[PDB]
Amino acid sequence: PSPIIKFPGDVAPKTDKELAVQYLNTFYGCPKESCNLFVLKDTLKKMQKFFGLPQTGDLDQNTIETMRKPRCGNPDVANYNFFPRKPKWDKNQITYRIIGYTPDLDPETVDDAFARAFQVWSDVTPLRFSRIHDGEADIMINFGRWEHGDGYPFDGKDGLLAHAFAPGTGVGGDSHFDDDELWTLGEGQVVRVKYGNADGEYCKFPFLFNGKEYNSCTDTGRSDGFLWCSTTYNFEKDGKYGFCPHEALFTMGGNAEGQPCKFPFRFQGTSYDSCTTEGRTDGYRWCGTTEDYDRDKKYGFCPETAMSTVGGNSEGAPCVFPFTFLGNKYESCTSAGRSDGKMWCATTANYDDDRKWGFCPDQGYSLFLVAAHAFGHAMGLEHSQDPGALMAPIYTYTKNFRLSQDDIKGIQELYGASPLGPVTPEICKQDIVFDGIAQIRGEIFFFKDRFIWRTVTPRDKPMGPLLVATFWPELPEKIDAVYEAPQEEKAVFFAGNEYWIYSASTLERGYPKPLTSLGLPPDVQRVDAAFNWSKNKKTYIFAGDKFWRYNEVKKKMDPGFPKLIADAWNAIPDNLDAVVDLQGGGHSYFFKGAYYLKLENQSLKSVKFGSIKSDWLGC
Template sequence: MSVLTALFVVGILCVRSHCAPTPQKTPLSIIFPGEIRSNMSDVEMAEKYLHNFGYLALEQGSDSHVSIRKALAHMQRKLGLHETGDLDQETMDAMRAPRCGVPDIGNFNTFEGELKWDHNDITYRVQNYSPDLDPEVIDDAFVRAFDVWSQVTPLTFTRIYNGVPDIDILFGSDNHGDPYPFDGKDGLLAHAYPPGPGVQGDAHFDDDEFWTLGTGVVVKTRFGNADGALCNFPFIFESQSYSTCTSAGRSDGLPWCGTTSNYDQDKKYGFCPSEYTAVIGGNAQGDPCVFPFTFMDNTYDSCTSEGRGDRKLWCATTSSYDRDRKWGFCPDRGYSLFLVAAHEFGHALGLEHSDIQDALMYPMYKYISDFQLHSDDVQGIQYLYGPKQGPGPKPPGPTKKPSTTTTKKPTTTTTTASTTTTTASIDPVDPTQDACNVKVFDAIAELQGDLHFFKDGLYWKVPAKSQGPPKAPLRIADTWPALPDNIDTAFQDPATKKIFFFAGRKFWQYTGSSVLGPRGIEKLGLDKDVQAVMGAIPRNNGKVLLFNGEKYWRMDVKAQTVDKDYPKNTDEEFAGVPTDFHDVFLYEGKYHFCQDRFFWRMTWRKQVDRVGYIKYDLLRCPEH
């Protein structure tokens, strides 16, 4: 048996250009600023691949040439390719394909015992979420992925929120806490460990990937005439096909999309929020595409592959690439979280990779719109756990969520060095504590998709879709036991999902329930005269802006140091907001500067588009 992840084909977007590009005998290919291209030869890449996935170690010998030929033949046989022993084009294409990070031969480590669970009710916990999808969409993808296996076995899957689960699920990037780092966008998509204690059974997903349902970014439109419907990609406009948001047909440059497959026919559309047009990679630090933009004196109002030998879609993040040379890749079809999760959960249940290309447990990724579990996968999982009792299996589809239980345990604290892991029992808080009676909050931050309001040891959560004020508060100490009662600001890094809290000259870093700190902000490179960090705006690509009144810094989250050429003056970059603010935070893709009872909302283009009441517009308290 085997693991998922396979060949991915990105549809080429038909772009509409105001000026036809100059005809060329060969495709134009330029080096974009900030782009790193590998100098590794095909042979070097092949050797690394064969070693990483367990083939080369099996064929070690005195003659390296013969050893590599044997390893290549073994790999070709294992992956269902033509067995030649040569590094041919089919083999190179397979090596470049997105795939699961679990080795094809052997496992990450040598684990003792039979690699299957000794019980049928498997528990799981979701540690964090990807910013690419709403949490409820991610939860549903995991539920459906588990159901793939419960349909054909006696296994059941129960989500828990406290205690120790069998399967811990997390999103992380690069070095994410285990010995097997991810490799950035594309390449390795995810990995999982076989059943057992500790890290065994856990599933990790690369947060540098673009996670979707397999058919492109899930964009919730605003305004327009489609009542907030999702974009439908691709869609037809003026007889041309668009696979991303576009400004075609508009003189104001606002990105929009069709919400049916044919705008020309149905006339249904909505506007795309800026966070859905943010670029990936490049040198623009996650800024949104700007349409139209100029490239080599031609004008484009959609993402284009012009100038790229690899035909990847990109856009400029200013109106003129020729002048500013700011750019990034456009979101593509992405990878189906459901399919990748179903594959990884197969590993977490004890399955290895399959050599059948249509099997779920085949190592390479391939999108399947009407997925059904292959007989090879069924035979493998039933060998471990037996068949499902009762009626025969039916093809998995939309399912009801498995029952969820909350397991309460006594408070336990384990401390090693400066890292603390805590499971805390939560006592009820007086429900009469009304957030609408608070005049000024200590801090406001968007964490895990919800807006959090902090005050004197308590916090209130306002979900994104909430229509009214928050209910009873929660205690900071119950959720983040290491923190003081009063904090100055907080933010969550979009890439790692780590949450940072600042209070005075100290800061704390939470990863799930584990905490690092407190540490002094001087460790970040902030001046000794900085007494507090009063606001934080996380950016893509691992950067965050830290504010202290008249000054602000840009910090690299991974290195945890501020960048050179900082601090800078707040009023020069963020004109139009008060400099005596007491908090700054990012919410729904826009910057919010708070002073007393009011907030100034600023777009990514640094334009103030609203001044509102914190109490009524953010807390959603009734006006009376």
């Protein structure tokens, strides 16, 4: 089941053309006036060129999927965007001022992310940044909205994340982050607990209380309307919590003694319906705690605000569980009715009766990463075309961030070495050994260290490189093997002693687990090969000089393994790295070093030779 519907007060989506033009207009220069068929193709191609697509004026199923990914606000072409044409700070000791904050994080967390982000650059150069609290700084950092005042409009949630100006005078070096995003540490809403036995810690989302997991703070269980979360998943066992900040419930310092803001509250000539930074330089939100702040002068600060709902019509009201939507009960956010996979929930017990809903918090974007990238702009750097480079336009979450050679190169190209960076694979121009090679949802996927190449047919150049984190962020630095499960069409990734199962970019719940869960002897803590067989549907996991079989139907291994690579296969070298059996052509190819071996399904002598780079990749 799944009927589609339009939700009351939702932002209609932009159609591909509308999207294209905006992308081309925003990042490529094609003027709003010149967009026509001719300009769309040509300019299109320039974008396609930059991102590795085929050069064509047509809007490719991937050309659209690419210009649909959140990215930086800066263009890809012509460093002629309001900064000094000489791309490089003329000093080596730079200052910055945080002018704006975001309500999604506590200042300490926001300050730290920025500093960590500057450190990204101090580490590989002689640039040293210092934070000043008054007057103009080299790099001013703010958070704003659509039109933030320098003439480069942001457009709400997702899409453009931030934009920084090149080193120069006035607006030069200045970094802006879109306030309509939700700034998490990259992995989900970040909230910093307010009081109790977890006063310093972050909420732990999800956390399990009474039978329900919470993915935002709740007043469930409470009587006094206060919000809370635990530090750990198991609240029942660990039992540590604190109150989540919200100025409707309480406020910090000031003279109001923790009481809630009073909304609206008259400040001088204005009535404020939220905290403001008016009257202030530190950028701290604040609010009168009584309706006439002048008359009573009772104020408290609003350092952080826990969110529950974003957009929709409920104005951030919390979800209600269980909630009934189209005659079915939902106890968690779903995408019923939305064709865009975005997750929402009702904010009342019944959507059918009330039609009130809202989007639930998503993974957000790390301010850290986004900052570090924007800050590269501020040092004079420009957009790299290297998928593994921080200064690539598109945003990709990377649990473990490492500045890439390409980045270090440029920053050191502008400034010193310091008082040597990761590199990125090129398939055709270098003979390399893939970590795992396997067909996925009908596409061949070639993995390596931090990147993956993919294709729908082996008689064409391979699409990529692409950082694998943009599909499988929870996966580690390198996989050991890959595979597909015949029953659910799910991807199963191996690495060290764990394995992950995904289904369409969604990390399986319960994953990762130790390989023992697959039914492998505790001795192995690695497996170097994997794949399924169309005839038998039996999954063989190769490690060293032995292999095993997995029953996907029975979810158990088969009668007493392992077997040998030579004892069960005639010509197969042990410690070989990959295996792939494309669907629909009885041939099983086993890869080792840079060159592979084939096989007919009905016979092991069944072979014909070849090599990976030449035979496999259009090279």
